[PDB]
Amino acid sequence: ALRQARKDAELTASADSVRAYLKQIGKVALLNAEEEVELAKRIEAGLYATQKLAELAEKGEKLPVQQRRDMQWICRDGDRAKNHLLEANLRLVVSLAKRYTGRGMAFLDLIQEGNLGLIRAVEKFDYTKGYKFSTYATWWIRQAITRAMADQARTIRIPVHMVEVINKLGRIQRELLQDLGREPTPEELAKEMDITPEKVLEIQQYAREPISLDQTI
């Protein structure tokens, strides 16, 4: 009744979203320099085979079966390659996702917001340079995550170029709270940002995250 309900409490609270996907990303083993290059070559060969087959599809000349099945097999090889690469590169995405925990947006979505940037990275990766796909994709993961966190983190919309000021305001206010000890003043904030002290007042009123109705007071 206590131990059984303890076991039931152990069994019921099972997935928890994060542990459900950590399992999934845990399965497909990560690549090394050769396999990344091979799968990139395979991807771009597949895309080249599709952009080739477009010609023979739209224009004409119904080619013999063997070469067609070969080209289809190269398309499928490209698909397999991009899918296997995307299934490989994920622990990077979660490792970068684990930086932006409790920053308006939920930790769970930021991984997928990372995965979009990852897929764009996979789209626009250049193997000829031979960069390491982590060190390459770091750009796209970050830019995608922070581009999402710019918009969807807040209830009210504020563009990235007008929220970066609020984030950096937060950071440097934390810095000035850390160093000087006390709270700094909008004037000194405007002296730090090099702006009109009537703007930092305007940006704080935006920085007021809205309050609920059904709250026990």
């Binding site: 997928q112 009123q205 809205p210 309050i211 609920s212 109705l213 059904d214």
Partner: peptide
Amino acid sequence: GRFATSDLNDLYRRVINRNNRLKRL
């Protein structure tokens, strides 16, 4: 000058955001 909103907005926003991501996926 503070804004008073409802929690529903957060949940609907989560749902529509996740939907609009899934669509792009």
